[PDB]
RNA sequence: GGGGCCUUAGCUCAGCUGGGAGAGCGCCUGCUGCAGGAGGUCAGCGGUUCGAUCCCGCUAGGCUCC
RNA sequence: GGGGCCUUAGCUCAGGGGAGAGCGCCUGCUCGCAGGAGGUCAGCGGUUCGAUCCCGCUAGGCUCCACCA
């Protein structure tokens, strides 16, 4: 994991630099596992994101806008009761574990000064945000409850004593000498990267591989020097925030990862890196989890129809072959003088077959139309926003951008928005865009003659909100709205179009974010 | 006795009142919590029909009901 | 079964004159500010110049009774 003890150390330093002494002005919880503190510090308003998400747990200052629920969750209201209005006195790391502790001076209901500790544990699935009394060391509440049945060592419930996770009894990299490295590392046993992780606290396999790489030939002379150099870089805050992309897979770190043969992009801090790294990924997995019941249903219903098609086909084939039964009783009728119920039984098998052809063919066609419908829904679910999931659910039961030139671009992200955009909002000569033979979002430029740059920007947006968002070249069709038509009885969003031109674009998240009107 | 309702995968139940057998939990696999697996004569039996938990015929059994 | 009481905005409650106030939630402003959000006044049909506040009924929720052989 890229968010390791060393990364936590660097983040803790950055947070102290940015928000120590800062007043918590507002607390929000936009998502189930994500809390946002609005902090007034050093003449600036900072947004601190605290994520206890199983896959995307992180702490950083974020520029991103987040939509808050109409009703704040109970944990948010609890945090507001205890620590909103308070001052962050200190931020510290628990050893070199992935646990940040925010010391927050607040006032009680009577007005007396109280100190609260906010523990932010970054442990993947077990990641948590826990508020305690500093005097009594008693848990006020945690974002995730841990019952004694789930963990015998530590309980995370209101009114219980806060206990850290079990210590790993590992050496501190920030205090380690050359002799400490030489005593603990068996240079003959191999897997030196693993040995480093086993002996040194806070060190990931990513860091350990970098250390082994920088050593060149990892031996008793080279590896201790490489480790101490890397530890010194961390201890002295000589951070180079970077993301390295190797074969489509991104790695982020607080130091340069020379062991990775890929394109390295540097940053002024780590927030932007994490925003980019987890952009789409956190949402897609959450959507996948919420959609899993529908997908399993939709995929089943699609599969059902294909199977239905196959059987009907066999009844059509039976119908064709049945002609034999017509022969059988014709011949039996001709030769009666030389059994008749057997003739008639064959004939009847024929007629039943023959009559099944037209019904089978019709039922194959209808099952094919259902497969196409379900294939469209599967794609829509893959690129949907949270609102789009609601609109698709309603169907199953039954955004503004500005170009570089200053032209308004409108986007529908679901079937209902797509229908509303194309049929009610868009003017007759406005330019409509959509991905060719790839399900996606309807995009409309509010201009009859947009410049080529605006077309490419709008196409990039269309491709970004399509199934092909991860492809290097995506075909996007565009035409005037007057050429786009909803067929009679078609579901919302579904349209036929003519007189189209196709452009090819690479989807880019940064371009889409830059063009988004606030 | 008279009426009433259900029997479905390892387990428990969905499924519109034919549109093509599912979920949750447990279990098996790998990953680092995730997906993906298995698994049903839909109690059984036989009509209907292009497909039947689905419609009806036809018997189990258990509950509801005096 | 009968009596007795209840049903107002997210929440808590004001209130025959055309449905408010605080808090929450939104507006910009940083312990106060500054404007919004939101009502079939349980419902019904009627008294009338107007009904949340008449009056008669229907819901529902509580409450008290339903005994004597």
What is the distance between the alpha carbons of residues A374 and A491, in angstroms, rounded to a whole number? 12
For strand C, give the nucleotides within 7 A of a protein CB.
Answer: 24-26, 30-31
CA dihedral A266, A267, A272, A277 (to 10 degrees): 10
What is the distance between the alpha carbons of residues A53 and A30, in angstroms, rounded to a whole number? 13
What is the distance between the alpha carbons of residues A135 and A162, in angstroms, rounded to a whole number? 12
**Integer distance in angstroms from CA A203 to C1' B25?**
38
DSSP A65-92: --PPPSS--HHHHHHHHHHTT-EEEEEE
What is the distance between the alpha carbons of residues A51 and A127, in angstroms, rounded to a whole number? 8
Residue A323 neighbours by CB under 8 Å, 6+ apart: A350, A354
Q: 10 Å Cβ neighbour count for A410?
A: 21
Nucleotide nearest to A300 (CA to C1'): B22
What is the distance between the alpha carbons of residues A432 and A461, in angstroms, rounded to a whole number? 12
What is the distance between the alpha carbons of residues A461 and A434, in angstroms, rounded to a whole number? 10
**Integer distance in angstroms from CA A143 to C1' C6?**
39
HEC string for A446-468 = CCCCCCHHHHHHHHHHHHHCECC
Q: What is the largest CA-CA distance in chain A?
A: 116
- How many CA atoms within 13 Å lie on the side-chain side of A380? 29
**Integer distance in angstroms from CA A375 to C1' B9?**
27
Please give the structure tokens belonging to residue A70: 């109409």
Residue A129 and residue A35 in contact, taking contact as beta carbons nearer than 8 Å:
yes
For strand B, give the nucleotides within 7 A of a protein CB.
Answer: 19-24, 32-36, 49-51
3-state secondary structure of A49: strand
- The 10 Å CB-count burial string (b at 16+, else e) for A298-330 is beeebeebeebbeebeebbebbeebeebeebbe
* Helices A281-321, A271-278: inter-axial angle, 10-degree rounding: 10
Nucleotide nearest to A40 (CA to C1'): C30
What residues approach strand C to within 7 A at the CB? A 25, 68, 70-72, 85
Nucleic strand B contact set for A 314-333 (CB, < 7 Å): 315
DSSP A287-336: HHHHHHHHHHHHHHHHHHHHHHHHHHHHHHHHHHHTHHHHHHHHHHHHTT
Residue A415 neighbours by CB under 8 Å, 6+ apart: A380, A388, A391, A392, A395, A491, A492, A493, A494
Residue A137 and residue A128 in contact, taking contact as beta carbons nearer than 8 Å:
no
DSSP A245-268: EETTEEEEESS--TTS-SEEEE-S
- How many CA atoms within 13 Å lie on the side-chain side of A36? 19
**Integer distance in angstroms from CA A449 to C1' C45?**
63
Nucleotide nearest to A308 (CA to C1'): B20
Residue A281 and residue A55 in contact, taking contact as beta carbons nearer than 8 Å:
yes
Closest residue by Cα to residue A222 from A192, A254, A259: A192
* Residue A316 φ then ψ, to 5°: -60, -50
**Integer distance in angstroms from CA A63 to C1' B65?**
67
3-state secondary structure of A401: strand
Residue A25 neighbours by CB under 8 Å, 6+ apart: A38, A39, A40, A45, A84, A85
* Residue A37 φ then ψ, to 5°: -100, 125
Please give the structure tokens belonging to residue A314: 């066999």
Residue A401 and residue A411 in contact, taking contact as beta carbons nearer than 8 Å:
yes
Does the nearest atom of strand B lie within 7 Å of A1's Cβ? yes
DSSP A97-161: SSEEEEEEEEE-SSS-EEEEEEEEE--GGG-EEEEEETTT-BEEEESS-B-TTT-SS--BSTTSB
Burial category of A22 from C-beta neighbours within 10 Å (exposed 0-12, middle 13-18, buried 19 and up): buried
- The 10 Å CB-count burial string (b at 16+, else e) for A464-482 is bbbbbbeeeebbbbbbbbe
**Integer distance in angstroms from CA A22 to C1' C30?**
14
**Integer distance in angstroms from CA A297 to C1' B39?**
18
**Residue with nearest Cα to nucleotide C30 C1':** A25
Residue A407 and residue A447 in contact, taking contact as beta carbons nearer than 8 Å:
yes
Does the nearest atom of strand B lie within 7 Å of A291's Cβ? no
Residue A259 and residue A244 in contact, taking contact as beta carbons nearer than 8 Å:
no
CA dihedral A366, A371, A372, A373 (to 10 degrees): 90
Give the CATH number of the domain where residue A51 resides: 2.30.310.10
After which residues does chain A break, using C–N > 2.5 Å?
Answer: 338, 398
What is the distance between the alpha carbons of residues A40 and A24, in angstroms, rounded to a whole number? 7
**Integer distance in angstroms from CA A322 to C1' B48?**
22
Resolution limit in angstroms? Answer: 3.4
**Integer distance in angstroms from CA A482 to C1' C50?**
54
What is the distance between the alpha carbons of residues A127 and A477, in angstroms, rounded to a whole number? 44
What is the distance between the alpha carbons of residues A62 and A278, in angstroms, rounded to a whole number? 13
- Cα A302 to the center of its chain, rounded Å: 25
Range of the domain at A95: 5-161
3-state secondary structure of A367: helix
What is the distance between the alpha carbons of residues A277 and A270, in angstroms, rounded to a whole number? 10
What is the distance between the alpha carbons of residues A325 and A52, in angstroms, rounded to a whole number? 71
Does the nearest atom of strand B lie within 7 Å of A300's Cβ? yes
């Amino acid at each position: 994991m890229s968010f390791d003890g060393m990364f936590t150390y660097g983040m803790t330093h950055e947070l102290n630099e940015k928000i120590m002494g800062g007043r918590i002005t507002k607390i929000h919880q936009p998502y189930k596992h994500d809390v946002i503190f609005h902090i007034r510090a050093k003449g600036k308003n900072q947004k601190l994101l605290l994520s206890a998400h199983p896959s995307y747990s992180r702490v950083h200052i974020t520029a991103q806008a987040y939509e808050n629920p109409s009703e704040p969750p109970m944990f948010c209201m609890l945090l507001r009761k205890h620590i909103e209005g308070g001052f962050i006195e200190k931020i510290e790391q628990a050893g070199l574990d992935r646990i940040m502790i925010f010391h927050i001076k607040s006032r009680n209901e009577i007005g007396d000064e109280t100190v609260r500790k906010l523990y932010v544990e970054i442990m993947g699935r077990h990641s948590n945000i826990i508020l305690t009394d500093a005097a009594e060391n008693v848990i006020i509440d945690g974002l995730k409850h841990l019952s004694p049945s789930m963990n015998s060592y530590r309980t995370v419930l209101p009114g219980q004593d806060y206990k850290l996770p079990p210590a790993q009894d590992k050496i501190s990299p920030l205090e380690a000498s050359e002799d400490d490295i030489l005593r603990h590392l068996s240079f003959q046993e191999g897997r030196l990267d693993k040995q480093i992780v086993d002996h040194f606290s806070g060190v990931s396999p990513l860091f350990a591989k970098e250390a082994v790489h920088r050593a060149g030939l990892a031996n008793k002379v080279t590896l201790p020097k490489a480790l101490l150099a890397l530890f010194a870089e961390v201890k002295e805050h000589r951070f180079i925030p970077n993301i390295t992309t190797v074969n489509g897979k991104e790695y982020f770190y607080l130091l340069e990862l020379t062991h990775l043969k890929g394109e390295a992009r540097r940053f002024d801090s780590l927030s932007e890196l994490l925003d980019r790294f987890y952009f789409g990924k956190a949402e897609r997995d959450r959507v996948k989890q919420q959609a899993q019941d529908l997908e399993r249903f939709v995929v089943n219903e699609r599969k059902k129809n294909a199977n239905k098609i196959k059987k009907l086909e066999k009844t059509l084939e039976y119908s064709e072959n049945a002609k034999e039964f017509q022969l059988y009783g014709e011949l039996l009728t001709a030769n009666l003088y030389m059994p008749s119920e057997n003739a008639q039984a064959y004939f009847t098998k024929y007629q039943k077959a023959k009559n099944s052809v037209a019904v089978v063919e019709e039922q194959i066609r209808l099952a094919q139309e259902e497969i196409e419908y379900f294939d469209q829904l599967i794609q829509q679910l893959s690129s949907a926003s949270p609102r789009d999931i609601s609109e698709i659910r309603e169907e199953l039961v039954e955004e503004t951008y500005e170009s570089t030139s200053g032209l308004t671009i409108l986007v529908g992200k679901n079937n209902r928005q797509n229908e509303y955009l194309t049929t009610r909002v868009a003017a007759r000569d406005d330019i409509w865009l959509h991905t060719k033979d790839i399900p996606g979002s309807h995009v409309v430029i509010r201009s009859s003659e947009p410049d080529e740059q605006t077309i490419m920007e709008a196409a990039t947006i269309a491709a970004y909100f399509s199934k092909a968002k991860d492809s290097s070249s995506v075909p996007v069709d565009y035409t005037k709205i007057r050429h786009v038509k909803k067929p009679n009885g078609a579901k919302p969003g579904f349209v036929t179009y003519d007189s189209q031109h196709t452009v090819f674009v690479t989807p880019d998240a940064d371009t889409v974010i830059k063009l988004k009107k606030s």
